[PDB]
């Protein structure tokens, strides 16, 4: 509790830090609730402490642009030191400074419009393996848990688009490439990571990691089997200033988690809103059958054509942005937009609280997809709606994620309807924990068309 006078000094407001803790007991209602309050209590800029670590929470559009886009290279290049990581030190979302810039380049031409359109026929082959697994349960009038069957698709899409491994993971729940894959910032351990960051080095010297030393060393070799037995990996092996062999292994892993629990979790958020807003599900099912008659197979070009679908995805991401907040470590005593920012301070943009501020959203907690209509889609600040971040360090797999999810919805809405159950949690309650996820796993009724 030494350097705790920083925010009283600069005349910057915020709640008072206790010695050695900071404002971490304020996380008992999860990040979002503490954010909503602090934006309401203190206004445009506030500060707090994550232990001995100061965090400055900005909410101004032009200030966010300078941090995410303008002075990204100069001042705000990296994210908060996350550890202990072992050999995942080299993963792009963890990597820092000139290793990020060297990895963000060797890995960018993997998500182009040419490579993304070339996965459309392959992501297609799996959207149908979903329908067979849905109709067997649809015929059996027994409520469906989305994240189970949804994640099985995202996992199936990942494995294929990355290494070619084709598994019907749903019916195949007991595969060496399935168990490993399926395996929280407010649990006992990460509370202590945020408060004993001095203990982080104690564990990087023990080969101890937040990723178990087994899954990695299973996929470490599985790749170097694939590497030497011959999608994202075919695009990465051809890329290796070249990629070290343990370095390429670490980039594969982050892709999987990225697309496995985000694609799965977001589709579960989309289906809840369609079922609890039956008129929206009706309008969508109509546009889908306009572009795609006779339950036609969707294409890359036709997916981008569907604009009520894009509206539906964005309003859901507004309500449930799995980022919650975006963060960067400032590296220089640089005053931006008239506010002196000292070195070492973490800058934090509160996405969730921003997406729910009545100052920029009329009826903010209601689900109104027409905010994003090509009529009203211009009154929207690109730096207030930040579901993939912004700028040089924004989400590297945005195009894939958006296309991945829409190819699922189209294939699903052509065939099924989704009704609320009794055990459906209406209105849904989020997590008191540290990620964007539901309290109860999402449960719905599913009827065939």
Ligand X SMILES: CC(C)(C)OC(=O)N[C@H](CS[C@H](Cc1ccccc1)C(=O)NCCc1cccnc1)Cc1cccc2ccccc12
Residue ranges at the known binding site for heme: 395
Q: Other CB atoms closer than 10 Å to residue 215's CB: what's the count?
A: 14
- Closer residue to ligand HEM (CB): 107 or 138: 107
Q: Is 323 in the site for ligand X (CB under 6 A)?
A: yes
Evaluate whether 268 touches 150 at the Cβ level (below 8 Å).
yes
Contact between 201 and its own copies (CB under 8 A)? no
Considering only 195, 258, 304, 435, the residue that binds ligand HEM (CB under 6 A) is: 258
Residue 289, phi then psi, degrees to nearest 5: -80, -10
- Among 259, 217, 252, which Cα is nearest to 234's? 252
Identify what 205 binds: ligand HEM, its own copies, ligand X, none; CB under 5 to 8 Å per kind: its own copies
Query: SS3 for 424?
Result: coil
Of 140, 142, 174, 427, the residue at the interface with its own copies (CB under 8 A) is: 174
Indicate the residue among 105 and 207 with the shorter CB distance to its own copies.
Answer: 207
- Taking Cα atoms as reference points, which of 279, 267, 285, 235 lies closest to residue 438? 267
Residues 181-200 that bind its own copies (CB under 8 A): 188-189, 192, 199
Segment holding 413, helix H or strand E: helix 398-413
Question: At closest approach, how far in Å is the CB of 144 from its own copies?
Answer: 21
* Pattern 205-234, its own copies, x by CB under 8 A: xxxx--------------------------
User: Distance between CA 205 and CA 224 in Å, rounded?
Assistant: 26
Number of separate helices (H) and strands (E) present in the chain:
19, 9
The string of DSSP letters for 306-333 reads -HHHHHHHHHHHHH--TT--EEEE--S-
Restricted to residues 65-104, the positions that interact with ligand HEM (CB under 6 A) are: 68, 92-93, 104
Q: Which of 95, 83, 115 is nearest to 397 (CA)?
A: 115
What 3-state DSSP class applies to 340?
Answer: strand
Judged by beta carbon, residue 183 or residue 422, the one nearer its own copies is 183
Distance CA 262, CA 267 (A): 8
Question: Which member of 203, 258, 291, 421 binds ligand X (CB under 6 A)?
Answer: 258
Q: What tokens does 305 get?
A: 């054509």
Phi, psi of 233 (to 5 degrees): -75, -45
Phi, psi of 170 (to 5 degrees): -65, -65
Per-residue string for binding with ligand X, 69-108, x by CB under 6 A? Answer: ----------xx-x--------x-xx--------------
With respect to ligand X, which residue has the nearer C-beta, 122 or 258?
258
Please state the closest distance from residue 337 (CB atom) to its own copies, in A.
40
Q: Is 171 one of the binding residues for its own copies (CB under 8 A)?
A: no
Q: Give me the DSSP letters along 92-140.
A: TTT--HHHHHHHHHHTGGGSSHHHHHTTHHHHHHHHHHHHHHHHHHHTT
| b/e sequence 4-31, b meaning 16+ C-beta within 10 Å | bebbeeeebebbebeeebbbbebbeebb
Q: How far is the CB of 2 from its own copies (least distance, A)?
A: 21
Please identify, among the stretches 40-48, 394-402, 406-414, 415-423, the one whose residues bind ligand HEM according to the rule CB under 6 A. 394-402
HSE, CB side, 13 Å, CA atoms: give it for residue 235: 22
CA R_g for the chain: 22
Q: Which of 5, 43, 109, 173 binds its own copies (CB under 8 A)?
A: 173
Which of 396, 446 has the CB closer to ligand X? 396
Q: Of the two residues 7 and 100, which places its CB atom closer to ligand HEM in the complex? A: 100
Find which of ligand X, its own copies, ligand HEM, none residue 82 binds, CB within 5 to 8 Å per kind: ligand X
Structure tokens given for 50: 């994550």
Q: Which residues bind its own copies (CB under 8 A)?
A: 173-174, 179, 188-189, 192, 199, 202, 205-208
Contact residues for ligand HEM, defined by CB under 6 A = 68, 92-93, 104, 254-255, 258-259, 262, 266, 322-323, 326, 387-390, 393-397, 400-401
Binding site for ligand X (CB under 6 A): 79-80, 82, 91, 93-94, 185, 254, 257-258, 262, 322-323, 327, 395
């Amino acid at each position: 509790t030494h350097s705790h006078g920083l925010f009283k000094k600069l005349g910057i407001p915020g709640p008072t830090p206790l010695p050695f803790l900071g404002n971490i007991l304020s996380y008992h209602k999860g990040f979002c609730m503490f954010d909503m309050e602090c934006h309401k209590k203190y206004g445009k800029v506030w500060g707090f402490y994550d232990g001995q670590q100061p965090v400055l929470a900005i909410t101004d559009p032009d200030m966010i642009k300078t941090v995410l886009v303008k002075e990204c290279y100069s001042v705000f290049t990296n994210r908060r030191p996350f550890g202990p990581v072992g050999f995942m030190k080299s993963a792009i979302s963890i990597a820092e400074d000139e290793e990020w810039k060297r990895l963000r380049s060797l890995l960018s031409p993997t998500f182009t419009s040419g490579k993304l359109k070339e996965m459309v026929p392959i992501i297609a082959q799996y959207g149908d393996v979903l329908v067979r697994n849905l109709r067997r349960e649809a015929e059996t009038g027994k409520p469906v848990t989305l994240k189970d069957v949804f994640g099985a698709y995202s996992m199936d899409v990942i494995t294929s688009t990355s290494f070619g491994v084709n598994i019907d993971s749903l019916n195949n729940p007991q595969d060496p490439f399935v168990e490993n894959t399926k395996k929280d910032f407010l649990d006992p351990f990460f509370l202590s990571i945020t408060v004993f960051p001095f203990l982080i080095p104690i564990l990087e010297v023990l080969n101890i990691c937040v990723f178990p030393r087994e899954v990695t060393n299973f996929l470490r070799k599985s790749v170097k089997r694939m590497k030497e037995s011959r999608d994202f990996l075919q695009l990465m092996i051809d890329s290796q200033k070249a990629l070290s062999d343990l370095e390429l292994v670490a980039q594969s892993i982050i892709f999987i988690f990225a697309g496995y629990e985000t694609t799965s979790s977001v589709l579960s958020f989309i289906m809840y809103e369609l079922a609890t807003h039956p008129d929206v599900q009706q309008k969508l099912q109509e546009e889908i059958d306009a572009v795609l008659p006779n339950k036609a197979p969707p294409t890359y070009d036709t997916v981008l054509q569907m604009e009520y679908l894009d509206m539906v995805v964005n309003e859901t991401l507004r309500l449930f942005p799995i980022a919650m907040r975006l963060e960067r470590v400032c590296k220089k005593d640089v005053e931006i937009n008239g506010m002196f920012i000292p070195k070492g301070v973490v800058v934090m943009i509160p996405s969730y609280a921003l997406h729910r501020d009545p100052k920029y959203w009329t009826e903010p907690e209601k689900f109104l997809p027409e905010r994003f209509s090509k009529k009203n889609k211009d009154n929207i600040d690109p730096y207030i709606y930040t579901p993939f971040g912004s700028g040089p360090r924004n989400c590297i797999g945005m195009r894939f994620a958006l296309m991945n999810m829409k190819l699922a919805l189209i294939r699903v809405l052509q065939n099924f309807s989704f009704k609320p159950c009794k055990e459906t949690q209406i209105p849904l309650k989020l997590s008191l924990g540290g990620l964007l996820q539901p309290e109860k796993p999402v449960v719905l009724k599913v009827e065939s068309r």
